[PDB]
Amino acid sequence: MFKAVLFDLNGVITDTAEYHFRAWKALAEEIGINGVDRQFNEQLKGVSREDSLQKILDLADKKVSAEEFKELAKRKNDNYVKMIQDVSPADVYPGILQLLKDLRSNKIKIALASASKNGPFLLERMNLTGYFDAIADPAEVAASKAAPDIFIAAAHAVGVAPSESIGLEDSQAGIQAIKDSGALPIGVGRPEDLGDDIVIVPDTSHYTLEFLKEVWLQKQK
Ligand SMILES: O=P(O)(O)OC[C@H]1O[C@](O)(COP(=O)(O)O)[C@@H](O)[C@@H]1O
Ligand SMILES: [Mg+2]
Ligand SMILES: [Mg+2]
Ligand SMILES: [Mg+2]
Numbered sequence: 328m329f330k331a332v333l334f335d336l337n338g339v340i341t342d343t344a345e346y347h348f349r350a351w352k353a354l355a356e357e358i359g360i361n362g363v364d365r366q367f368n369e370q371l372k373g374v375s376r377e378d379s380l381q382k383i384l385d386l387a388d389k390k391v392s393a394e395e396f397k398e399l400a401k402r403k404n405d406n407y408v409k410m411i412q413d414v415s416p417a418d419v420y421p422g423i424l425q426l427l428k429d430l431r432s433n434k435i436k437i438a439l440a441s442a443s444k445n446g447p448f449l450l451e452r453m454n455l456t457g458y459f460d461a462i463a464d465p466a467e468v469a470a471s472k473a474a475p476d477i478f479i480a481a482a483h484a485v486g487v488a489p490s491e492s493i494g495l496e497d498s499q500a501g502i503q504a505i506k507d508s509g510a511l512p513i514g515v516g517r518p519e520d521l522g523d524d525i526v527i528v529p530d531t532s533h534y535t536l537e538f539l540k541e542v543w544l545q546k547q548k
Contacts, residue, residue, distance in 0.1 A: 330491040333481040336441035338497025341418045350407035360387045373500030375470040414452040422532040427458040429536040436460045436485035440478045460485045473500040475508035
């Protein structure tokens with residue numbers, strides 16, 4: 328039996344992609360960069376804050392100092408944070424609160440393995456903090472594309488190996504990260520996106536304890 332579930336945040340617990348998009352678009356427009364549209368935001372799925380900014384600058388072949396780069400990232404984050412101030416418990420994705428309750432009821436550890444430094448704030452806004460035995464801090468581990476480090480950190484923060492854990496993710500890069508950690512991925516979304524040889528559910532209403540248990544047993548030799 329798995330000992331922990333490692334939760335992604337965006338696309339699993341809730342999704343703030345619309346606010347990330349609007350904050351990036353506002354930053355781009357402020358510096359005279361056109362072309363940050365909704366489809367462009369698709370290109371940022373599984374992409375870090377810094378790598379996202381770099382893609383936007385690349386749109387306009389815009390060159391900046393390392394220091395200016397840091398300031399631009401901070402600017403976007405400030406705007407993003409303003410926008411997520413209105414997140415509430417009503418923004419919790421379907422099935423997620425019940426899953427957290429069922430995991431807690433069965434003494435299965437719950438860890439956050441979000442790439443976002445805004446994870447703790449978002450859990451507080453959703454009244455979910457106390458369900459989480461640990462929050463892995465993305466500032467303290469690798470943020471490169473598909474890096475397993477956040478999932479490894481999340482498992483370790485609740486006293487388990489990734490091999491004893493399930494990881495939930497909405498992005499191709501995050502699924503890859505989970506695989507590389509040694510945890511068992513269960514993706515939410517479309518296979519065309521998430522990849523092959525994993526269990527994929529179409530929406531979070533399918534993330535039930537019963538289903539996670541069935542999948543675990545299917546994937547054990
Ligand atoms: O891994 P999650 O919870 O889906 O969060 C993904 C988000 O994390 C980031 O990589 C970093 O988020 P922050 O800018 O809030 O620190 C975003 O670019 C991305 O949209
Ligand atoms: Mg996500
Ligand atoms: Mg993630
Ligand atoms: Mg269904």
